[PDB]
Swiss-Prot record, chains A, B, C:
This is Polyhedrin. Major component of the virus occlusion bodies, which are large proteinaceous structures (polyhedra), that protect the virus from the outside environment for extended periods until they are ingested by insect larvae. Keywords: Glycoprotein, Host cytoplasm, Late protein, Signal, Viral occlusion body. The lineage of its organism: Viruses, Riboviria, Orthornavirae, Duplornaviricota, Resentoviricetes. The keyword Phosphoprotein does not apply.
C-alpha cells in the first residue's frame, strides 16, 4: 500500500475528513437538530443550564421563579424565598428577611447551535410577573436579538452563537423566553402543508435538560466538553469542535 | 400659547389621548399579546393565579394535582395529599385521613384579555384523571364556551372577558385546559404558510406566571391593579383600565 | 311487543350495539382524541404513568430526572440522588453513595390509543443529557418505531398499540419523547391553512396526567380498567374494551 500521509490513497484520512464533514453538514440539513441553551449564573459561582434540542425550531421559556437558584437536597430558605418573590412581583409586597436574594441570577448567557439561522432568533425578556414591556397592552411579544449574538469560533469555524447579558442591578428581575429556527436556505417551507404535522410533532419530540453545576469549571469539564457543545467562558475563551473539512 | 383645556391646540391633551388609544389598538393588532388567566379559589381565601401571555394564541393546561393548593415553605400534609389523590382518581382508592381536602379549588375564574376573539375560546374540563367526558372513546377534546363569557367593562369599554364556575360539590374534582386565539378581523391567516413558523415560535416565546396570593384583596392590590389587568371580584366589581380614546 | 333476543325489533339491543359502535368510531374521527401513555417500571414494583390526551396529535417528552422514581410524601434520598444524576451525566462526575439507583426505571412501555396511525409514531430516546445519538451533530431527532408496536387486542378488536423495552443494564440511562398523530384516512389535512390554528390550540388544550402506582395490580385495577384503557401486563395479558359492532 501507499505510505500514510503521502498520497491521495490515504483512504483512512479521507474517511476521517468525510466523517467530520458529514457531521457538520447533517446538523445543518433540515433533518438535523437545532439546540438552545440558557445559562443562569449565580453569585455562589454555580450555573443552571437549561437545554432544549429539536428539529425545525427550538426554544425555552422560564418564569422568574424557575430561574432562581435551587440547590437539590439542600436548604433553600424556601419560606423566605416565597416572600422574596412577593416583594419582587410588587414593591414592598413581601415580608422577606433579606434585601437581595442570592438565588437571583447575576447574568444570563443564551447559546444556539450553529444550525440556527441567527436572523430568526427571538427573545421575550419580561419582568418578574412575565410581562415583556411594563404592561401587556403596549408589549411586543419578542425582540429579534440576532444582531447581538457573537460567533463562537474554533479553528476559524462557527461552532455556535452567544448572547450574554449581566443582571448586576437590584432591578434586574426577569422572566425569559428565547426561540430560534433551524437554518433553511431552501424554498421548501418546513411549515407548509406538506410537512406541518411533522413540525407539530417536533413540539412533542424535543428533548429538554436542566441541571445546576457548582462552578463554570465543572460545567466546562463535565457538560460542555464531553458533549462537544459550544460555549464562551467568563474569560472569553471559546469552546467547541470544528468539524467541516477537518480531521 | 393657548390655555390648557380650551382649544384644539392642547397638544399635551391630544398626545395623552393618542398614547392611550395606541396602547388599546396595538394590543388588538396581530403584533399584540393575547393573555389568559386561570384563578383557582381555595377555602382558606387564597387564590392561585396562572397566567400565560403570547402572540397569536394562548392557553393553559393543568392537572388535577397542579390546581390543588400548595403553600410554599409551609406544611402541606404531602403524604396524606398523595393519598387524597389516589382516592380522587378512583373511589376508595386511597388511604387518606380526611373526607374533603381543603386544598381542592372551590371555584375557578378564567379571564381573557380583550384581544381574544371570544368565538375562539375552547375549554377542556376533564375529570381528575384528565379525561374530558368519562371515557376517552366518547370525549370531544374541548367545548367552545365563549357564549358564557361575561364582558368585564370599565367606563363602558371591554377590558376583558370572564367565565366563572363554582366547584362547591364533593364530586367537582377537575383537570382543566383553556385556549383562545387573538382577534384577527383580516383575511391574513397568521397560520398560513407565510407566517406559520412564527406561530411555532410563539409556542416557545409565551411567558408564563404562577403564584398563590393569600386573599382576593392581596390579588387585587398587588397583581391585578398594578399590572392594569382585567378582573371580576366576588362582589361582581370590575377591575381594569379603559384606554380607547380616553385621557 | 316482540320477545327480547328473537327478532329485528329488539330496539334495545340495536341501540346498545350502536352506542358501542359510535364510541369506537367517534374516537377515530378527526373530532376524536388520540392518547399516549408512558409507563416507567421500577424495581420496587411501582409504576409511573404519564398520559396525554389531545386532538390531532399527541406526545410526551421527559428528562432523565423526571423518569426517576419519586415517592410523594416519603424520603427519596434527594441529596444523594442529585449526586447520582451527576454521575450519570458524566462518568465519575458525582459523589453518590450507591452503585445503582433503584429510582432508575427498569423498563418502559409506550401505549397509544387505537386512534393513532402507527406509521406516524416517532420516538426520541436520548441519553441522560437529552441527546438522541451521542452528539447533537450526528443525531436524527427521532426514529419511527411503529413497526415495533404490538396490537393490543380484545375479542379480536385492536384496542391499542404497545411498544415495550427493558432497561436492565447499568448503561440504560435515558431521556425519552414520543409522539403520534391521529388517524386521518381523508385528504383533508388537519394542519392545512383552514384548520391549522385549531391544531395550535390543541397544543394548549391537551390534558396531561401523571401518578405513581405501587404495583402493576393497582395500576390495572384502579387506572387501566376503570377508564377502559388499553394495556399489556407483564404476563402478556391484554386489557381494554372491544366496542365495534358489539353489545
Ligand atoms: Cl435537507
Ligand atoms: Cl396587524
Ligand atoms: Cl371526521
Ligand atoms: Pd441555608
Ligand atoms: Pd448597567
Ligand atoms: Pd409548539
Ligand atoms: Pd432541573
Ligand atoms: Pd482564551
Ligand atoms: Pd399542617
Ligand atoms: Pd350545583
Ligand atoms: Pd404549540
Ligand atoms: Pd408557581
Ligand atoms: Pd361594584
Ligand atoms: Pd429512605
Ligand atoms: Pd441486553
Ligand atoms: Pd405544539
Ligand atoms: Pd406527577
Ligand atoms: Pd393471558
Amino acid at each position: 500500500a501507499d505510505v500514510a500521509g503521502t498520497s491521495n490513497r490515504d483512504f483512512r484520512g479521507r474517511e476521517q475528513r468525510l466523517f467530520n464533514s458529514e457531521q457538520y453538514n447533517y446538523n445543518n440539513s433540515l433533518n438535523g437538530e437545532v439546540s438552545v441553551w440558557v445559562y443562569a449564573y449565580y453569585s455562589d459561582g454555580s450555573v443552571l443550564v437549561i437545554n432544549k434540542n429539536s428539529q425545525y425550531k427550538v426554544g425555552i421559556s422560564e418564569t422568574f421563579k424557575a430561574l432562581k437558584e435551587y440547590r437539590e437536597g439542600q436548604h433553600n430558605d424556601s419560606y423566605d424565598e416565597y416572600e422574596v418573590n412577593q416583594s419582587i412581583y410588587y414593591p414592598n409586597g413581601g415580608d422577606a428577611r433579606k434585601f437581595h436574594s442570592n438565588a437571583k441570577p447575576r447574568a444570563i448567557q443564551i447559546i444556539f447551535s450553529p444550525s440556527v439561522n441567527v436572523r430568526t432568533i427571538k427573545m421575550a425578556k419580561g419582568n418578574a410577573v412575565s410581562v415583556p414591556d411594563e404592561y401587556l397592552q403596549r408589549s411586543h411579544p419578542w425582540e429579534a436579538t440576532g444582531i447581538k449574538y457573537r460567533k463562537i469560533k474554533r479553528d476559524g469555524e462557527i461552532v455556535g452563537y452567544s448572547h450574554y447579558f449581566e443582571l448586576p442591578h437590584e432591578y434586574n428581575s426577569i422572566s425569559l423566553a428565547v426561540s430560534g429556527v433551524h437554518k433553511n436556505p431552501s424554498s421548501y417551507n418546513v411549515g407548509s402543508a406538506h410537512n406541518v404535522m411533522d413540525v407539530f410533532q417536533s413540539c412533542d419530540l424535543a428533548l429538554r435538560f436542566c441541571n445546576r453545576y457548582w462552578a463554570e469549571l465543572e460545567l466546562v469539564n463535565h457538560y460542555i466538553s464531553p458533549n462537544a457543545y459550544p460555549y464562551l467562558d467568563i474569560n472569553n475563551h471559546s469552546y467547541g469542535v470544528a468539524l467541516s473539512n477537518r480531521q
